[PDB]
Scaffold this active site. Structure first.
Site, PDB file in Angstrom:
ATOM      1  N   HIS A  51       1.886  -0.288   0.103  1.00 31.77           N
ATOM      2  CA  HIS A  51       2.980   0.434  -0.538  1.00 31.77           C
ATOM      3  C   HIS A  51       4.091  -0.520  -0.947  1.00 31.77           C
ATOM      4  O   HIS A  51       4.785  -0.299  -1.937  1.00 31.77           O
ATOM      5  CB  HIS A  51       3.549   1.495   0.405  1.00 31.77           C
ATOM      6  CG  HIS A  51       4.177   0.934   1.648  1.00 31.77           C
ATOM      7  ND1 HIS A  51       3.541   0.936   2.868  1.00 31.77           N
ATOM      8  CD2 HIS A  51       5.390   0.368   1.855  1.00 31.77           C
ATOM      9  CE1 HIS A  51       4.331   0.393   3.776  1.00 31.77           C
ATOM     10  NE2 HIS A  51       5.461   0.037   3.187  1.00 31.77           N
ATOM     11  N   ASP A  81      -3.892   0.847   4.363  1.00 28.30           N
ATOM     12  CA  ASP A  81      -2.615   0.538   3.735  1.00 28.30           C
ATOM     13  C   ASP A  81      -2.229  -0.915   3.972  1.00 28.30           C
ATOM     14  O   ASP A  81      -1.070  -1.218   4.230  1.00 28.30           O
ATOM     15  CB  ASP A  81      -1.521   1.449   4.292  1.00 28.30           C
ATOM     16  CG  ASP A  81      -0.171   1.200   3.645  1.00 28.30           C
ATOM     17  OD1 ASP A  81      -0.144   0.778   2.470  1.00 28.30           O
ATOM     18  OD2 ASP A  81       0.862   1.425   4.310  1.00 28.30           O
ATOM     19  N   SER A 154       8.285  -2.482   8.087  1.00 24.59           N
ATOM     20  CA  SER A 154       6.970  -2.050   7.702  1.00 24.59           C
ATOM     21  C   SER A 154       6.305  -3.228   7.043  1.00 24.59           C
ATOM     22  O   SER A 154       6.811  -3.775   6.066  1.00 24.59           O
ATOM     23  CB  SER A 154       7.033  -0.870   6.747  1.00 24.59           C
ATOM     24  OG  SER A 154       5.751  -0.301   6.566  1.00 24.59           O
TER      25      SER A 154
END
Lengths: 199, 199, 199
Positions: A51, A81, A154
């Protein structure tokens, strides 16, 4: 007090923190802060979240020592991801400590590292381990921890008191954060590196 | 790194975690996950929260070793939101370590255990102790901790680095979770067991 | 379990907690709980947040040993949201341990102390350090930590495992709390004490 020493996990920070980097986009000029990443090896391969680099025109990576490279996307993996970037390795790259022999145990102390405010580190423990959702791999899917996990970290690293890599902070049920076990992250990186060389 | 050992509270997890169980309802077929509980003694008595078993048609308890019993409600206590269940004890029951001599001190490290995602453990310290609200007991009413307390661990155990029982996670002022001191929880259990045998 | 000892930071609590106090207002009779503060020295000087004492008609300070003084506002500092109070020092004042030689390192364990529920303590680590926003001082501006910081401990102390003062919990980007480095807090206090004696 003056004589003794404070309880601290700064050791782990010294060892693993240099290897965790920032990841930016440079559209056009706009320079946005995308998220964090982790230098894996001397070849200059870096793991980050998919992302983070999803809509990236130009990807830039910044180390804690001041150096700034441009990275290219080796390939990504939607299910986990994750994403692997590649950068030219000038002599001397800081890499994330890895122990393939180390077995993570529930209760272990872990630090979460990433750049939101500059580099930041939070402390927790391994809350749980197992497999979740669609598990094609057949191997353990997730690693849970009560260390704060957010956009600011993240894609960053999750390490123990030693500094050894336990997982990759990810976003893919409250108060708990998730990381991808380093054993699974390693395998996914390799398959993305290899299958990147394909017609 | 390879030689040394990570800082961990997995010891406490090994000792106390087997004793913490799941609690379900089995209406009709619907099998709902109610919350968590704690095996107290070999007789097969278990503590849990009253809200967990409030509207329970059939109560079921599942251990981490795979066994599954049906439990009966010995009795509950609204003021402390506790409840005692009873199960047939096949040879060998895992029980929650208890030290009646141990005095909990503020600052002590504590792990919170319960099943929301499977068994989960969070780490904090004893933030505070004292008495709160209506205190008929006259004895210390509450135990505060910054370990995450939620429905997923409500009714579960709270233990120190040793694994010794400090309290029962409960829901009965932000960022802080509460547990019922094990000294008070013991007394309430006994009175519920005894006064359960009454016309 | 009975023989061994639990992992704990109660030592730091014993040393530093007595020095952290409550701060009230006493308008008119209404007695409101404003926040927390920290006794700094035997002269009876106390640090607290400016917002705590902003609209204070009469300021009152309560120690953990039962004593209750009235405090006067020596002066405040908007930029760092600090404020220094002064109280008559009866023989024996508990003061916050301070080590001017100690260098805070990222990863260090820290306890946050303040009264919201009575005195309360939470545990975290030093997440980050540096300078933020307008920095006229030229020196390091902030100290970040994942120990819970709230109104209940705003103005209170932040200390390491030893009990040594690391900073002053403050309110002046999620999951993270802030404290003012003790080196900067010291300097600001002195300048407020000195420049309080001015025409």
């Amino acid at each position: 007090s003056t004589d003794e020493t404070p309880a601290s996990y700064n050791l782990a920070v010294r060892r693993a923190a240099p290897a965790v980097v920032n990841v930016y986009n440079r559209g056009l000029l706009e320079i946005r802060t995308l998220g964090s990443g982790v230098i894996m090896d001397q070849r200059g391969y870096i793991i980050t979240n998919k992302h983070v680099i999803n809509d990236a025109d130009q990807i830039i990576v910044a180390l804690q020592d001041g150096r700034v490279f441009e990275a290219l996307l080796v390939g990504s993996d939607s299910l986990t991801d994750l994403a692997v970037l590649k950068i030219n390795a000038t002599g001397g790259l800081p890499t994330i400590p890895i122990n393939a022999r180390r077995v993570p145990h529930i209760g272990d102390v872990v630090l979460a590292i990433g750049n939101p405010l500059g580099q930041t580190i939070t402390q927790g423990i391994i809350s749980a381990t197992g497999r979740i959702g669609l598990n094609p791999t057949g191997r353990q899917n997730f690693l849970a921890t009560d260390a704060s996990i957010n956009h600011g970290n993240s894609g960053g690293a999750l390490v123990n008191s030693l500094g050894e890599l336990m997982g990759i902070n990810t976003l893919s049920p409250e108060g708990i954060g998730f990381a991808i076990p380093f054993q699974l992250a390693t395998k996914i990186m390799d398959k993305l590196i290899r299958d990147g060389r394909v017609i």
